[PDB]
């Protein structure tokens, strides 16, 4: 699949807002993910002990992790589709070291959309959300293709 320049512009416009506070967006996204799909928390040995949202918000390590994840996702989005190089190491670590099913990538994509919708309604209308969903589906499609090449079905 391919996004038009117009769709990329909608994606990058709202992402520019996210970049005004990466750490804050990272926390909301992971808390949303862990609360909506608790099973995903079991994949993080470093955070699986967190019991409440209060504990999650207070975790310095979780906040730092969120910045690392969003920064990588941002680098990929800014390539506007030409992200083959950025995807390689990401796909290998998540398929071989962390063992993350495509299903879980769908869950975090939902968390991202939810948080952007909550925080940036003025820059995340129907068209912009459609553009973001398309960019995330492209991301998941390409990561899935790499998973297969690497020998991981998940
Ligand atoms: C938006 C998609 C995602 C991106 C861009 C992303 C990015 C990253 C990055 C950059 C790291 C650190 C470097 C590395 O280990 O490769 C990381 C670590 C990790 N990711 Fe992801 N990730 C994504 C989705 C997920 C999902 C959905 C899970 C599973 C619920 C997951 C589980 C992990 C784990 C377990 C680690 C190691 C954390 C640690 O022990 O420090 N990731 N991810």
Curated annotation (Swiss-Prot):
Q: Which UniProt keywords apply?
A: Cytoplasm, Heme, Iron, Metal-binding, Muscle protein, Oxidoreductase, Oxygen transport, Phosphoprotein, Transport
CC per GO annotation: extracellular exosome; sarcoplasm
Residues reported to bind nitrite: 65
Q: Which ranges carry the Globin domain?
A: 2-148
Against Gene3D superfamilies, the record matches this protein to:
6.10.140.2100, 6.10.140.2110
Phosphoserine PTM sites in chain numbering: 4
Question: Care to name a GO molecular-function term for this sequence?
Answer: oxygen binding
Q: Tell me which Gene Ontology terms the entry assigns under biological process.
A: removal of superoxide radicals
The subcellular location is: Cytoplasm, Sarcoplasm
Q: What is its EC number?
A: 1.7.-.-, 1.11.1.-
Q: What is this protein called?
A: Myoglobin
Give the organism, scientific name: Physeter macrocephalus
